[PDB]
């Protein structure tokens, strides 16, 4: 029943600020300490700052101090996280911990926001090709490729289809990622049904649900 | 401000007792650096185990304790679930802040699958082409996935990710060679090849 949740990854351009959200529940909002971390890519955490929700006492690190800026909304039970002058040395995943006192902190963490300081993906059906059954069972996938940034929304048959659906970690390659995902239906299935494989791309608005056809 | 050091990956069977130590740049850890223990699991989940030196933390397995040894501190697992295989960072509070270490990546059998895909028409339509083969059912997610075209080996073009352990206690992953859609009319075979654990395993497609 504890729970603190982040905002969604974000995109920003350089020169440019990021107010990243932490709700939290299951607790009392002001008698617990906010603190937030980041970790740049091949880095370690990085300490920022931390929040008294209560007190509304924020507590910077020297070098941080004048570009980090917590504010709490007591009604709400949300810490935000102003990020201003944002370079690409910025780009990490933040997260956001509770604590109490040095003996007793950072025991729940949020899932962590990223921050990446746009093109969207271009999706290709791939049927069988060995028309030859493996077995009783046939497996499509979906080629995502070269979008960006991070990340996208593989879905088969708009959620219908979740048993055996394998979405893979993307690859890295100039910039733009690919990344793919398989579904194994069993092969009765198809294709005398219609199997679509549905992918967001939040950061450019898109959507595409392409129709798998042999 | 000092520098948290940890040994980068300690390996151990389950039900042995591994000891994760850290120490500073600063001198001794005493007390008053109140020592967090942080156990991170991928896609960057953290829990927190121990705090201020050898404090459980709220509903955590007894085996996890924390102490002093000597001038360092100690992350002591008795009893390793295979659970228990993650990541473990030190905190050391370096008053007005903490300082973390970089990790301890503690690790406490399966041949893997080949599936290879032939490139998309519309993508072909492009003058691309991208083979996919997705390794599946490999245990421990370790292994080298190499190309051959007409028995030759290639080594530009390949792209492999990084093995995802599926919530079965098993890997995965994705090659992908990209070539042309004239290279790809050009040959005869295409062979994704896998080593894992001393012996291969190779899947091939025309």
């Known amino acids: 029943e504890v729970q603190l949740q982040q905002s969604g990854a974000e995109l920003a351009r350089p020169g440019a600020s990021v107010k990243l959200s932490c709700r939290t529940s299951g607790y009392s909002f002001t008698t617990y300490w906010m603190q937030w971390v980041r970790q740049r890519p091949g880095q370690g955490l990085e300490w920022i700052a931390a929040?008294?929700?209560?007190?509304?006492?924020?507590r910077y690190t020297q070098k941080f101090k004048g570009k980090a800026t917590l504010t709490a909304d007591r009604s709400s039970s949300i810490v935000y996280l102003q990020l201003n002058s944002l370079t690409s040395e910025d780009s990490a995943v933040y997260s956001c911990?509770?604590?109490?006192?040095?003996?007793?902190?950072?025991?729940?963490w949020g899932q962590g926001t990223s921050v990446t300081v746009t093109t969207p993906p271009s999706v290709y059906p791939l049927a069988p090709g060995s028309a030859a059954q493996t077995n009783s069972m046939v497996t499509l996938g979906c080629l995502v490729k070269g979008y960006f940034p991070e990340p996208v929304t593989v879905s088969w048959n708009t959620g219908s289809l979740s048993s055996g659906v394998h979405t893979f970690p993307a690859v890295l390659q100039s910039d733009l990622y690919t990344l793919s995902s398989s579904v194994t239906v069993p092969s009765s299935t198809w294709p005398s049904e219609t199997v679509t494989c549905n992918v967001a791309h939040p950061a450019s608005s898109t959507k595409v649900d392409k129709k798998i056809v042999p | 401000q000092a520098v948290v050091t940890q040994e980068s990956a300690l390996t151990t069977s389950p039900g042995e007792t591994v000891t994760l130590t850290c120490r500073s740049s600063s001198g001794a850890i005493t007390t008053s650096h109140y020592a967090n223990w942080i156990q991170e699991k991928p896609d960057h989940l953290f829990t927190g185990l121990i705090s201020?030196?050898?404090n459980r933390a709220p509903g955590v397995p007894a085996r996890f304790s924390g102490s002093l040894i000597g001038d360092k501190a100690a992350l002591t697992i008795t009893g390793a679930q295979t659970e228990d295989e993650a990541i473990y960072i030190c905190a050391l509070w370096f008053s007005n802040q903490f300082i973390f270490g970089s990790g301890t990546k503690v690790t406490v059998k399966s041949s893997p699958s080949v599936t290879l895909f032939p490139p998309s028409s519309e993508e072909l339509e492009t003058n691309k082409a991208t083979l996919v083969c997705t390794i599946t059912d490999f245990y421990p997610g370790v292994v080298t996935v190499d190309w051959k075209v007409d028995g030759t080996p290639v080594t530009q073009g390949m792209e492999t990710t990084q093995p995802s352990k599926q919530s079965n206690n098993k890997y995965m992953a994705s090659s992908y060679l990209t070539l042309t859609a004239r290279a790809w009319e050009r040959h005869s075979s295409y062979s994704c090849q896998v080593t894992h654990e001393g012996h291969t395993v190779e899947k091939s497609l025309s």
């Open positions: 929040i008294y929700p209560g007190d509304d006492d924020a």
């Open positions: 911990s509770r604590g109490r006192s040095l003996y007793y902190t950072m025991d729940y």
């Open positions: 201020g030196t050898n």
